């Protein structure tokens, strides 16, 4: 049942012509075979993205994310911010079985587990979730925070994102501070005095799952110091 349900290769050499694919694997329905799916897409003249790139997605190609389910990875967050549809790998399989492109809207993967809704949420077109938002990122980790949330927020329509390490801005011009327990007490006190909300990354992630700016103090996990 497995090898057959994985599907064959597309006879139409140009089945996926004009589509770019960004596959992501949830950390460990038929199981996701990343390289086999890549072979199926490449055989139908599908273009495989090395990583997220809005220079081809916003231009010639119709980008789509391929995954086995909803996951909390960088590619998933970038597509949730850019509004790129999250589509199950079965869509590839079921299409190669038919040698005809299937409606990916029937293969939409969920966004994730919502804290406000207390359940897994189905995906809807986002159309920017951080419009007109000035964010200050404060952290000790530069790569998986100062760069990660910078790119994710910027591709989400943020008006401005500033990157500040936990040792060295305009402040008051910002709308929210996204940090972690490595936030210095100076930033916390200055933000408190200015009535500037300070949240954790879970507020951003939940904003991506729900698809809209949710309340800063809506859930206890939104606090940066949540230990």
């Amino acid at each position: 049942a497995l090898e057959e349900q994985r599907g064959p290769l597309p006879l139409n050499k140009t089945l996926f012509l004009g589509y770019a694919f960004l596959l992501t694997m949830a950390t460990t329905i038929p199981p996701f075979n990343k390289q086999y799916t890549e072979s199926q897409l490449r055989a139908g003249a599908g273009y495989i993205l090395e990583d997220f790139n809005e220079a081809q997605c916003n231009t010639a190609y119709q980008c789509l994310l391929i995954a086995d389910q909803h996951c909390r990875t960088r590619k998933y967050f970038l597509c949730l911010a850019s509004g790129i549809p999250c589509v199950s790998h079965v869509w590839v399989h079921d299409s190669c079985h038919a040698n005809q492109l299937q409606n990916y809207r029937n293969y939409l993967l969920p966004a994730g587990y919502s804290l406000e809704e207390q359940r897994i949420l189905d995906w809807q077109p986002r159309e920017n979730p951080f419009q007109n938002l000035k964010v200050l990122l404060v952290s000790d980790q530069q790569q998986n925070f100062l760069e990660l949330w910078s790119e994710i927020l910027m591709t989400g329509g943020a008006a401005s994102v500033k990157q500040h390490h936990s040792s060295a801005i305009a402040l008051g011009v910002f709308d929210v501070v996204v940090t972690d327990p490595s936030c210095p007490a100076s930033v916390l006190k200055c933000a408190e005095a200015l009535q500037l909300p300070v949240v954790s990354q879970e507020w951003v992630i939940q904003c991506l799952i729900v698809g809209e700016r949710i309340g800063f103090k809506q859930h206890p996990k939104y606090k940066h110091d949540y230990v």
């Binding site: 992501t24 694997m25 949830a26 950390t27 996951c71 909390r72 990875t73 960088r74 590619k75 967050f77 998986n144 990660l148 990354q201 992630i205």
Partner: peptide, 4 residues
């Protein structure tokens, strides 16, 4: 990939 790595999840967050």
């Amino acid at each position: 990939s790595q999840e967050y």
